[PDB]
Amino acid sequence: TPDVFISYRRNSGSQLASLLKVHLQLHGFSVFIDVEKLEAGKFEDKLIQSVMGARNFVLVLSPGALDKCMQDHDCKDWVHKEIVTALSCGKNIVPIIDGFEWPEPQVLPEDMQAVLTFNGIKWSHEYQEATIEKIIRFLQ
Amino acid sequence: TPDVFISYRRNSGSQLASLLKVHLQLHGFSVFIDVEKLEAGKFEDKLIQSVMGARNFVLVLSPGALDKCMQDHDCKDWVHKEIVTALSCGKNIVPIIDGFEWPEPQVLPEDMQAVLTFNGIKWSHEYQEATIEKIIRFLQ
Amino acid sequence: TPDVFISYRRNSGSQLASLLKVHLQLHGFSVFIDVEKLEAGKFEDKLIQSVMGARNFVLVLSPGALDKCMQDHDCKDWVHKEIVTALSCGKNIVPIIDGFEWPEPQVLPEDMQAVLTFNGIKWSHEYQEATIEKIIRFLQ
Amino acid sequence: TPDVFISYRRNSGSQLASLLKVHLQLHGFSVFIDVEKLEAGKFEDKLIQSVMGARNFVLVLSPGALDKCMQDHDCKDWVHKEIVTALSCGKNIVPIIDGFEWPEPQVLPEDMQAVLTFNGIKWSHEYQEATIEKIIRFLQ
Amino acid sequence: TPDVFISYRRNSGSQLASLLKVHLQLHGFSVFIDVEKLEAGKFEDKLIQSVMGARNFVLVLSPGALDKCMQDHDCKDWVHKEIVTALSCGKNIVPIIDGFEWPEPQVLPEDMQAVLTFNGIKWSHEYQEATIEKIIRFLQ
Amino acid sequence: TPDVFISYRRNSGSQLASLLKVHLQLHGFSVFIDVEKLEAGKFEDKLIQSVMGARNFVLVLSPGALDKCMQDHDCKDWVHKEIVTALSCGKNIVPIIDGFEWPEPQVLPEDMQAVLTFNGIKWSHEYQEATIEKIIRFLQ
Amino acid sequence: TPDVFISYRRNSGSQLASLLKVHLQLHGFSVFIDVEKLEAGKFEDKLIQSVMGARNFVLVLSPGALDKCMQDHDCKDWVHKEIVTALSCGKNIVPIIDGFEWPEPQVLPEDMQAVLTFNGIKWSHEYQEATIEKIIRFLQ
Amino acid sequence: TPDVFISYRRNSGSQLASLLKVHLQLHGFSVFIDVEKLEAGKFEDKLIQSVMGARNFVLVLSPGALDKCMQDHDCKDWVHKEIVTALSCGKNIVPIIDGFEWPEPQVLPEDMQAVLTFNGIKWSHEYQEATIEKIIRFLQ
Ligand SMILES: Nc1ncnc2c1ncn2[C@@H]1O[C@H](COP(=O)(O)OP(=O)(O)OC[C@H]2O[C@@H]([n+]3ccc4c(I)cccc4c3)[C@H](O)[C@@H]2O)[C@@H](O)[C@H]1O
Ligand SMILES: Nc1ncnc2c1ncn2[C@@H]1O[C@H](COP(=O)(O)OP(=O)(O)OC[C@H]2O[C@@H]([n+]3ccc4c(I)cccc4c3)[C@H](O)[C@@H]2O)[C@@H](O)[C@H]1O
Ligand SMILES: Nc1ncnc2c1ncn2[C@@H]1O[C@H](COP(=O)(O)OP(=O)(O)OC[C@H]2O[C@@H]([n+]3ccc4c(I)cccc4c3)[C@H](O)[C@@H]2O)[C@@H](O)[C@H]1O
Ligand SMILES: Nc1ncnc2c1ncn2[C@@H]1O[C@H](COP(=O)(O)OP(=O)(O)OC[C@H]2O[C@@H]([n+]3ccc4c(I)cccc4c3)[C@H](O)[C@@H]2O)[C@@H](O)[C@H]1O
Ligand SMILES: Nc1ncnc2c1ncn2[C@@H]1O[C@H](COP(=O)(O)OP(=O)(O)OC[C@H]2O[C@@H]([n+]3ccc4c(I)cccc4c3)[C@H](O)[C@@H]2O)[C@@H](O)[C@H]1O
Ligand SMILES: Nc1ncnc2c1ncn2[C@@H]1O[C@H](COP(=O)(O)OP(=O)(O)OC[C@H]2O[C@@H]([n+]3ccc4c(I)cccc4c3)[C@H](O)[C@@H]2O)[C@@H](O)[C@H]1O
Ligand SMILES: Nc1ncnc2c1ncn2[C@@H]1O[C@H](COP(=O)(O)OP(=O)(O)OC[C@H]2O[C@@H]([n+]3ccc4c(I)cccc4c3)[C@H](O)[C@@H]2O)[C@@H](O)[C@H]1O
Ligand SMILES: Nc1ncnc2c1ncn2[C@@H]1O[C@H](COP(=O)(O)OP(=O)(O)OC[C@H]2O[C@@H]([n+]3ccc4c(I)cccc4c3)[C@H](O)[C@@H]2O)[C@@H](O)[C@H]1O
C-alpha cells in the first residue's frame, strides 16, 4: 500500500493536495490520492482499506474543511469517515494548515476529536523548500 | 456474449449512449445495445438474458434518468429492471455521469440503492481522449 | 488541411457533434473540431479562417440551438458569426435536424435566414448507420 | 534566460501557480516565479525585464482573479502591468482556467482587453495528466 | 534532555524568546523551544515530559503575558498549565521582565499563585550585555 | 567600515534588531547598532557617517515603524534621517517585514518614497533559518 | 549573613541607600542590598531571614517612606515586614532621616511604633563626613 | 586640577551626584564638586574657572535639573552658567540621565541648546556596574 495517504476536501483544497503529491513523489514516497488511485468497484471498501495500509496520514486543512463533519453523528461525511479510521488504527496524522481557523472541540463529533491534538505543519508560500523539508522530517 | 452492455434512458442518454457505444467497439470491446439487436416479438427474455451474459454493466446517468422510478414498488419501469439483474447477479457496474445530481439514498427506493455506491466516471467534453482511457481501465 | 468544419452548440449538441466527427474521419476525411485542433493564440482569427479553409460545412440543430442566436444583430454570437461566414462564400452546408421547434424566420436575423433552404439530413435514433451513408455521400 | 513567466494572484492562484511551475521544470523548462527568482533591489525592473525576456507568458485565472484589474486604469496593479508587457511585446500567452467566470470585454481596461481573446486551457482535477501535456503543447 | 526550557506567549514574547535561545546556546546550554524541537505526533505529551526533564525554566513575561491565565481554572490555557507543572515539580522558575506589570495575586489561579513570589530579571536594551550575564547566573 | 547598518524603532523593533544583529555577526559581517557602536560626542555626525559607510542597509519594519515618519516634513525623526541618507548614496536597502501594514505611498513624505519600492524579506518565526539564509543572499 | 542590612523605599531612598552601601563597604562592613545580592530562588524567605542574620539594621527614612505602611494590617508591605523581623530579634535600628517629618503613631500599627523611639540620624549634604562618622559610631 | 566637573541641582542631584563622585574617584579621576571644594571668599570665579581646566563635563539630569534654566536670558541660574562655559570652550560633555523627560529644544535658551545633542548615559539601579563601566568609556 502507498506510504502517505492524503485526505482533503474536494471543493476547497484540491490544488494543495496535488502539489503535496508531486513533491513527496520526487523524494521517494508512494502517495495515494483519489483522483489517481481509485478505480472500478464500490468506492467505500477502497478508501477505508487504503487508509489503514498507509504508514502516514496527511490531512490537508483548508478554510472550512470540517464544516460538513459538523452534526454528522451518523458518520456519513467522507472526511468524517477517513479521520475515524486513522485514529482507531493509530496512524501518524500530519495535518497541514493552509488558512484553517481552528474551532473548539465541542463543535465537532465525539469520534473525530483527537485530530485537533496533533502537531501540524504551517504551509508557507514564501519559504516552500523549508516547508517541504519540514514535512519530510515528520513522515516515517 | 458481448463484453459491454449499455443501459440508458430513452429520452435523455440516447445520444450519449450511441456516442459511447461506438467508441468501445473501435477498441475491440463488443457492445450490445437495444436499437441494434432487439426483435423477435418476445423481447423481455432476450434483453434480461443480455445483461446477465455481459459481465460489464453501464448505467448512463443522464440528467434525471431516475425521475420515473420513485415508488415503483411493482418495478414496472424498464430502467429499474436492468440494474436489478446487475445487482442480483453482482455485475461490474461502471456508471458514466453527465450532469447528474445525486439524490440522497433515502429518496430512491431501498431496492435499487446499490447503484449509488459504485464509483463513476465523469464524461469530459474537452479532454475526451483521456476520458476514453479511464473507461477502458474500468471495463473488464 | 481541414476538409470538414463542424458547427454545434456546446449546451445541447456536444454529444451529437462528437458522434458525427468519429464516423466522418473514420472513412478517411479530414475534420476540424474546436476541442481538438484549436491551438495557442487568438482564436477569432482561426475559427473564421478555418471555416473558409473547409470546403464542407456542417450545422447541428437542437432545442435551444438558436435561442441565443435570436436578436444577435451585432453578430457577437459565435454560432451566428460562423454560419454567415461559410454562407457568404457558398460553402457546402449540410444541416442536421434534431427534435426542436422550428422558429419563424422573422425573429431570426435576416442575413442568417438563407441557410434554411439547404437539404438537411434528419438524425434517426434507430438507423444511425443509414444516416452515415446519406451524409458521407453529400461530401466528396 | 527564462523561458516561461508565471503571473497569478497570491490569494487565489498560488497553489495552482506553484503546481504549474513544478511540472514545467521536469520537462526542461526554465520557469520564472516571483517568490523564487526575485531578489535584492527594485523589483519593478526585474519583473518587467523578465516579462519581456521569456518567450512564453503564462497567466493563472482563478475565481475573480481580475477584479483588482477592473477599473484600475492607473496601471498600479502588477498582474495588469505584466500582461500589457506580454501583450505589447507579442509573447506567447497561455491562460489557465480554474473556476474562472469570464467577464464581458468592456469592464477591463483597453490595454488589457486583448487577453480575453486568447485560448485558455481548462484545469481539470480529474484529468490533470491530460491538462499538463496540453500546456506543454502550447508552450513553444 | 534540555538544560533550559523557554515558556513564552506567541503574540508578544517570540522576539525576546528567540534572542534568548541564541545567547543561551552560545554559552553551551541546550534550550528547548517549541518551534525548533516539537515534532510529529500529539504535542501535549512531549513538552510536559520535556519541562519535567528541564533543569531550569525561563518564563518570558511580556505586556499582558499572563492575561489569558485568569479564570482558567480548567488548566486548559497553555501558559497556565506550563507553569503549574514546574511549580508542581519544583523547578527553578526564572521570570524575565520586559514591559510586564504586576497585578494583585488574588486574580490568578491558586495553583499558579506561587509564581508571583519569585526573583525576576529585568531585561534592558541599553545594557543587554549585563542582563545576559545575570540570566546565566540564575541558571543552575 | 562595517558591512551592515541597522535602522529600527526603539519602541517596537528592539528585539528584532538585536536578534538580527547576532545572526548576521555569526556569518562574518560587521553590523552597526546604535546601543553598541555609538560612543560619546555629537551622535548626529556619527550616525550619518555610519550610514554612508556600510554598503548594506537593513531596516527593521515592525508594526508602525513608519508612523512617526508621517508628516515629518522637517525631517526630525531619526529613522527617516537614516533612510534618506541610504537612498541618496545608492546603498543596498534590505527591509525586513514583521507584522507590518504596508501603506499607500502618499502618506509618507516625498523624500523617502523609494524605500517602499525595494524587495524585502518576511520574517518567519517557524522558518527562521530559511529567513536568515535569504537575508545573507541579499547582503554583499 | 551580613554585618548591616539596608531597608529603604525604591521610589525615594535608592540613591541614598546606594551612597550608604559604598561608604559602609569602605569601612570593612559587609552589607546587604537587594539590587545586587538577591539571586536565584524565592526572595521572601531570603530577605526576611537576612534581617534576622544581619548584625545591624538601617532604615532610610526619606519622603514618603512610611506612607505605604499605613493600615498594612496584613503586613504585606516589605518596609513594614522588614521592621518587625528587626524588632523581634532585638536588632539595632539606626534610622537615617533625609527630609522626613515624623507623624503621630496612633494610626500606625502598634507593632511598628517602636521605631520612632530610636535615636535618629540626620543626613547633611554639607557635612557628609560628620554624619558618615556618626553612623559608624552607631553601628555596634 | 580636577579632570571631571559635576553640575547638579542640589534639590535632586545631591544624592546621585555624591554617589557618582565616589565611584569616579576610585577609578582615578580627580573630580570637582561644590560641597567638597567650593572654598570661602567669593565663589563665582571658583567653579567657573575650574570647569575650563577640567577636560570632561559630567552633568546630572535629575527630574527638573534644567527647569529653572528655562528663560534664563540673564544667565542667572548657576547650572546655566556651567553649560555655557563647557560648550563655549568645546569641552567633552557626558550627560547622566535619571528619571529625565527630554524637552524640545525651543523651550531652552539658544546658548545651551547644544547640550541636548550629546550621547547621554542612562543610570540603571539594577545594572550600575555596567552603567559605571559605560561612563569610563565615555570619559577622556
Ligand atoms: N410492444 C412494443 N414494441 C415496440 N415498442 C414498444 C412496445 N411497447 C412500448 N414500446 C415503446 O417503448 C417505449 C418505452 O420506453 P421509455 O418509456 O422511453 O422508457 P425508458 O426511456 O426508461 O427506457 C430506456 C431503456 O429501456 C430499454 N427498453 C428496451 C426495449 C423496450 C421495448 I421492445 C418496449 C418498451 C420498453 C423498452 C425499453 C432500453 O434498453 C433503453 O435503454 C414506449 O414509450 C413505447 O414508445
Ligand atoms: N459514485 C460516484 N462517482 C462519482 N462521483 C460521485 C459519486 N458519488 C458522489 N459523487 C460526487 O462526487 C462528490 C464528492 O465530493 P463530496 O461528496 O463533497 O466529498 P468530500 O469532498 O467532502 O470528500 C473528499 C475526499 O473524500 C474521499 N472520496 C473519494 C471518492 C468519493 C466518491 I467516488 C464518491 C463520494 C465521495 C467520495 C469521497 C477522497 O479522499 C476525497 O479527498 C459528491 O459530492 C458528488 O457530487
Ligand atoms: N516592497 C515589498 N517587499 C516585500 N513584500 C511586499 C512589498 N510590498 C508589498 N508586499 C507584500 O506582498 C504582497 C503582494 O501581494 P499583492 O500586492 O496583492 O499582489 P498580487 O498578488 O495581487 O499580484 C500577484 C503578482 O504580482 C507580482 N508581484 C511580485 C512582487 C511584489 C512585491 I516584492 C510587492 C508588491 C507587489 C508584488 C507583485 C507577481 O508576479 C505576482 O504574480 C502585498 O500585498 C504585501 O503584503
Ligand atoms: N477566451 C476563451 N478561452 C477559453 N475558453 C473560453 C474563452 N471564452 C469563453 N470561454 C469558454 O468557452 C465556452 C464556450 O463558449 P459559449 O459561450 O458556450 O458558446 P457556444 O459553446 O454555445 O458556441 C459553440 C460554437 O461556437 C464555437 N466556439 C469556439 C470557441 C469558443 C471559445 I475558445 C470561447 C468562446 C466561445 C467559443 C465558441 C464552437 O466551435 C461552436 O461551433 C464559453 O461559454 C466559456 O465557458
Ligand atoms: N493542533 C495544532 N497543531 C498545530 N498548530 C495549532 C494546533 N492548534 C492550534 N494551533 C495554532 O498554534 C497556535 C498556538 O499558539 P496559542 O494558541 O496562541 O498559545 P499561546 O500563544 O497562548 O501559548 C504559547 C505557549 O504555548 C505553548 N504551545 C505549544 C504548542 C502548541 C500547539 I503544536 C498547538 C496549540 C497550542 C500550543 C501551545 C508554547 O510552548 C508557547 O510557549 C494556536 O493559536 C493556533 O494558531
Ligand atoms: N516577584 C517579583 N520579582 C521581581 N521583581 C518584582 C517582583 N514583584 C515586584 N517586583 C518589582 O520590584 C518592585 C518592588 O517595589 P515595591 O514593592 O513597591 O517595594 P518598595 O517600594 O517598598 O521598596 C523596596 C522595599 O521592599 C523590599 N523588596 C525587595 C525585593 C523585592 C522583590 I525581588 C520583589 C518584590 C518586592 C520586593 C521588595 C526592599 O528591601 C525595600 O525595603 C515592584 O514595583 C516591581 O517593579
Ligand atoms: N553667599 C552664600 N553663601 C553660602 N551659601 C549660599 C549663599 N547664597 C546662597 N546660598 C545657598 O545656596 C542655595 C542656592 O542653591 P540652589 O538654589 O539649589 O541652586 P543650585 O541647585 O542650582 O546650585 C547647585 C549647583 O550650582 C552650583 N552652585 C555652587 C555654589 C552656589 C552658592 I556658594 C550659592 C548659590 C548657588 C550655588 C550653586 C553647584 O556646583 C551645583 O552644581 C541657597 O538657597 C542658599 O541656601
Ligand atoms: N541625547 C540622548 N541621549 C540618550 N537618550 C536620549 C537622547 N535624546 C533622546 N533620548 C531618549 O532616547 C529615546 C530614543 O527613542 P525614540 O525617540 O523613539 O527614537 P527612535 O525610535 O527613532 O530611534 C530608533 C532609531 O533611531 C536611531 N537613534 C539613535 C540615537 C538616538 C539618540 I543618542 C537620542 C534620541 C534618538 C536616537 C535615535 C537609531 O539608529 C535607532 O535605530 C528618546 O525617545 C528619548 O527618550
For residue D52, the 8-state DSSP code is T
CA B15–ligand 1 middle distance (angstroms):
16
Grid cell of D32 as nine digits: 520564472
Q: Could you tell me which of F24, F22, F25, F43 has the C-alpha nearest to residue F34?
A: F43
Q: Could you tell me which of G103, G105, G123 has the C-alpha nearest to residue G113?
A: G105
D133 in contact with F, Cβ within 8 Å: no
Ligand 2 atom closest to the CA of B118, numbered from 1: 1
Sign, CA dihedral F47-F51-F53-F58, equals positive
- Euclidean distance between CA atoms F124 and F127, whole angstroms: 5
- Map residue B45 onto helix, strand or coil: helix
Burial state string for G83-98 with b = 16 or more CB within 10 A and e = fewer than 16: bbbbbeeebebbbbbb
Inter-residue contact D48 to D20 (CB < 8 Å): no
Phi, psi of F126 (to 5 degrees): -80, -35
Closest-CA distance of chain E to residue A126, Å = 17
- Euclidean distance between CA atoms G98 and G118, whole angstroms: 16
Task: Give the list of residues 6+ apart from residue C100 with CB closer than 8 angstroms, or none.
Answer: C61, C62, C63, C64, C65
Inter-residue contact C31 to C4 (CB < 8 Å): yes
- Map residue A28 onto helix, strand or coil: coil
- Map residue A52 onto helix, strand or coil: helix
Grid cell of D9 as nine digits: 494572484
- Best probe of the H interface among E119, E124, E127, E138, by most H CBs < 10 A, is E127
Inter-residue contact G62 to G122 (CB < 8 Å): no
SS3 string of E88-100? HHCCEEEEEECCC
Asked if E15 and F19 come within 8 Å (Cβ–Cβ), the reply is yes
The residue assigned the cell 481554572 is E73
Q: Which helix (H) or strand (E) holds D125?
A: none
For residue A55, the 8-state DSSP code is S
DSSP strands (E only) in A62-133 = 92-97, 121-122
Strand C4-7 relative to strand A56-61, pairing: unpaired
Closest residue (by CA) to atom 35 of ligand 2?
A: A78
The residue assigned the cell 503529491 is A21
Burial state string for E49-66 with b = 16 or more CB within 10 A and e = fewer than 16: ebbeebebbbbbbbeebb
Grid cell of C132 as nine digits: 452515415
Inter-residue contact G139 to G94 (CB < 8 Å): yes
Q: Which of D5, D8, D10, D72 to mutate to test the pocket of ligand 3 (most atoms within 8 A of CB)?
A: D10
Burial state string for F72-84 with b = 16 or more CB within 10 A and e = fewer than 16: beeeebbbbbbbb
The residue assigned the cell 442480483 is B88
- Exposed/middle/buried for G53, CB within 10 Å: 0-12, 13-18, 19+? exposed
- Best probe of the D interface among A19, A21, A26, by most D CBs < 10 A, is A19
Strand ordering across the sheet containing H4-7: H31-32, H4-7, H56-61, H92-97, H121-122
Inter-residue contact F96 to A126 (CB < 8 Å): no
Measured CA distances, B19 to A104, C94, E84, F74 (Å): 52, 20, 72, 79
Inter-residue contact F31 to F6 (CB < 8 Å): yes
H84 in contact with G, Cβ within 8 Å: no
Task: Give the list of residues 6+ apart from residue D119 with CB closer than 8 angstroms, or none.
Answer: C38, C39, C40, C41, C42, C43, D95
Residue C44 marked as a ligand binder? no
Active site residue D82: yes
Task: Give the list of residues 6+ apart from residue G45 with CB closer than 8 angstroms, or none.
Answer: none
Query: What residue of E is the nearest CA neighbor of G40?
Result: E138
Q: Which helix (H) or strand (E) holds A13?
A: none
Q: Could you tell me which of C93, C96, C102 has the C-alpha nearest to residue C131?
A: C96
Asked if E122 and H126 come within 8 Å (Cβ–Cβ), the reply is yes
Task: Give the list of residues 6+ apart from residue A28 with CB closer than 8 angstroms, or none.
Answer: none
Q: How many CB pairs under 8 A join E and F?
A: 27
- Exposed/middle/buried for E69, CB within 10 Å: 0-12, 13-18, 19+? buried
Length of chain D: 140
Ligand 8 atom closest to the CA of F7, numbered from 1: 42
DSSP string, chain H: --SEEEE--TTTHHHHHHHHHHHHHHTT--EE-HHHH--SS--HHHHHHHHHH-SEEEEEE-TTSSSSSTT-TT--SHHHHHHHHHHHTT-EEEEEESS--PPPGGGS-TTTGGGTTS--EE--SS-HHHHHHHHHHH--
As beta bridge partners, residue E31 has E4
- Euclidean distance between CA atoms G135 and G59, whole angstroms: 12
CA B119–ligand 3 middle distance (angstroms):
43
Phi, psi of G121 (to 5 degrees): -125, 130
D124 in contact with B, Cβ within 8 Å: yes
Asked if A131 and F127 come within 8 Å (Cβ–Cβ), the reply is yes
Please tell me if the CB atom of residue H3 comes closer than 6 angstroms to any atom of ligand 7: no
Measured CA distances, D47 to D112, D113, G47 (Å): 18, 21, 66
What was the elucidation method? cryo-EM
- Euclidean distance between CA atoms D56 and D92, whole angstroms: 5
Please tell me if the CB atom of residue B64 comes closer than 6 angstroms to any atom of ligand 2: no
Selecting from G22, G35, G128 the residue whose C-beta is nearest the C-beta of H125 gives G35
DSSP string, G1-35: --SEEEE--TTTTHHHHHHHHHHHGGGT--EE-HH
Contacts of A38 in chain D (CB under 8 A): none
Asked if E119 and G43 come within 8 Å (Cβ–Cβ), the reply is yes
**C-alpha angle F42-F46-F47 in degrees, rounded to nearest 5:** 115
Residue F10 marked as a ligand binder? yes
- Map residue A11 onto helix, strand or coil: coil
Measured CA distances, D36 to B80, D1, E10, F95 (Å): 58, 15, 28, 17
Asked if F19 and E23 come within 8 Å (Cβ–Cβ), the reply is no
Task: Give the list of residues 6+ apart from residue B133 with CB closer than 8 angstroms, or none.
Answer: none
Inter-residue contact A84 to A75 (CB < 8 Å): yes
- Euclidean distance between CA atoms A95 and A91, whole angstroms: 12
For residue D13, the 8-state DSSP code is S
As beta bridge partners, residue A38 has none
Q: Could you tell me which of G132, G112, G136, G110 has the C-alpha nearest to residue G122?
A: G132
Of B82, B110, B126, B133, the active-site residue reads B82
Grid cell of C17 as nine digits: 457533434
Please tell me if the CB atom of residue A78 comes closer than 6 angstroms to any atom of ligand 2: yes
Measured CA distances, F26 to E132, F4, F130 (Å): 18, 13, 15
- Euclidean distance between CA atoms G88 and G90, whole angstroms: 5
- Euclidean distance between CA atoms D15 and A123, whole angstroms: 11
Neighbouring chains to E with at least 3 Cβ pairs closer than 8 Å: A, F, G, H
Inter-residue contact H34 to H47 (CB < 8 Å): yes
Asked if F119 and D38 come within 8 Å (Cβ–Cβ), the reply is yes
DSSP string, G27-76: GT--EE-HHHH--SSBSHHHHHHHHHH-SEEEEEE-TTTTSTTTT-TT--
CA H82–ligand 7 middle distance (angstroms):
13
- Best probe of the C interface among B9, B10, B15, B24, by most C CBs < 10 A, is B15
Q: Do chains A and F touch (3 or more CB pairs under 8 A)?
A: yes
